[PDB]
């Protein structure tokens, strides 16, 4: 019996391939699941997570903080066009709104 | 020479076109436009006739609904003429535009 | 004998509340309202604290979005004051009312 | 009585992108919600794709097509690149 290595390490990933496979098999999506579907899905999920985290960390740094809070995630999402399209009908709790005042309301 | 005032014929056409069900765009130009748009995604594509028929029905329904919203926006501003600003406001509130 | 002109404190309030993230409604009145609305569907109902928290968060987000749409409809008509007709127009175009 | 989540993997990804940055518990809860939401979206699209074509198996082809159907352009291109690279590496150095 050789020493076990996770499928994530084989795929060069951080997200759990075995857990994604188990969730696919117990969700009533199909009758059978191929070998490469959980690897592909875990890679896509990792990529999207990294994109959002990279934007939110820049927002937190620009506010002079070392921790990320929901406001930073909201600013990152609402200032980026693709993310704003993807999460258009989503509400983030304690995220607030983007500062925007119309020009007519401003004083002359 | 007999003549009608501006608005009589327009109301006649509104009544006439709100009573029928036939398509209002010609089929051949719409077909050419669909093939032209599709050329970007894939070359040497073929179409069933029912696919282009479905596309045309969807397109006309979408445009008629948008014109209804635009007319509401124009009347809200104390006008009877529709302008591009009304279309922009309607599309913004519907959510088809940040 | 020191007074600000109308609109100065309003702009300060806009800048103050577009920067914070806290809830703007008192918790006890909102909880009373939720329990009273719920008592019509079923009697003797209990609520988790997180359930009322989620309801309040969703309600405030919904109202803020509606107010932004209402402001756009009011500026379209060459005004700075929002009126009930702006709310009705925004809700009709959003599709929440026929 | 044991409840699973994505917190440790999100923390690893964060430590990769921003080595000296932390996160709060509420932000991590929002991240878990995001991951679950995107998972269900992609899985449902792939399930419908398999049903349309009269297939019993969900493969990486269905995942790729669902990703192209659900993501905006550049996001979809880079996600397809990452997924293809991961599958090649997995099948490469088995």
């Amino acid at each position: 019996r050789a020493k076990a290595k996770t499928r994530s390490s084989r795929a060069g990933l951080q997200f759990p391939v075995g857990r994604v496979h188990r969730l696919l098999r117990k969700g009533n999506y199909s009758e059978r699941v191929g070998a490469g579907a959980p690897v592909y899905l875990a890679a896509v999920l990792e990529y999207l997570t990294a994109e959002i985290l990279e934007l939110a960390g820049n927002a937190a740094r620009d506010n002079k903080k070392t921790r990320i809070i929901p406001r930073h995630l909201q600013l990152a999402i609402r200032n980026d066009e693709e993310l704003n399209k993807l999460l258009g009908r989503v509400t983030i709790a304690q995220g607030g709104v983007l500062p925007n005042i119309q020009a007519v309301l401003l004083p002359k | 020479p007999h003549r009608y005032r501006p608005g009589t014929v327009a109301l006649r056409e509104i009544r006439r076109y709100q009573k029928s069900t036939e398509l209002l765009i010609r089929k051949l130009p719409f077909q050419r436009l669909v093939r032209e748009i599709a050329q970007d995604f894939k070359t040497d594509l073929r179409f069933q006739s029912a696919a282009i028929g479905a596309l045309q029905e969807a397109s006309e329904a979408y445009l008629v609904g948008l014109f209804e919203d635009t007319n509401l926006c124009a009347i809200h501003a104390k006008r009877v003429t529709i302008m591009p600003k009304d279309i922009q406001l309607a599309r913004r509130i519907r959510g088809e535009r940040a | 004998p020191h007074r600000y002109r109308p609109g100065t404190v309003a702009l300060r309030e806009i800048r103050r509340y577009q920067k914070s993230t806290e809830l703007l409604i008192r918790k006890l009145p909102f909880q009373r309202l939720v329990r009273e609305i719920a008592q019509d569907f079923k009697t003797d109902l209990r609520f988790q604290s997180a359930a009322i928290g989620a309801l309040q968060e969703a309600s405030e987000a919904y109202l803020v979005g509606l107010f932004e749409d209402t402001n756009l409809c009011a500026i379209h008509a060459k005004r700075v004051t929002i009126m009930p007709k702006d709310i009705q127009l925004a809700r009709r175009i959003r599709g929440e009312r026929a | 009585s044991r409840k699973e989540s994505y917190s440790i993997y999100v923390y690893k990804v964060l430590k990769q992108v921003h080595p000296d940055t932390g996160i709060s518990s509420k932000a991590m809860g929002i991240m878990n919600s995001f991951v679950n939401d995107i998972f269900e979206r992609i899985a449902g699209e792939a399930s419908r794709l398999a049903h349309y074509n009269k297939r019993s198996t969900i493969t990486s082809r269905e995942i790729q097509t669902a990703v192209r159907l659900l993501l905006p352009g550049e996001l979809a291109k880079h996600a397809v690149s990452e997924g293809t690279k991961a599958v090649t590496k997995y099948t490469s150095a088995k």
Binding site: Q102 | - | - | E74, L75, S81
Partner: peptide, 18 residues
């Protein structure tokens, strides 16, 4: 299907009324 570098991030344009 594999590509190079980062993606082209874009700005969201908001409707303004003259």
């Amino acid at each position: 299907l594999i590509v190079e570098g980062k993606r082209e991030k874009k700005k969201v344009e908001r409707l303004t009324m003259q």
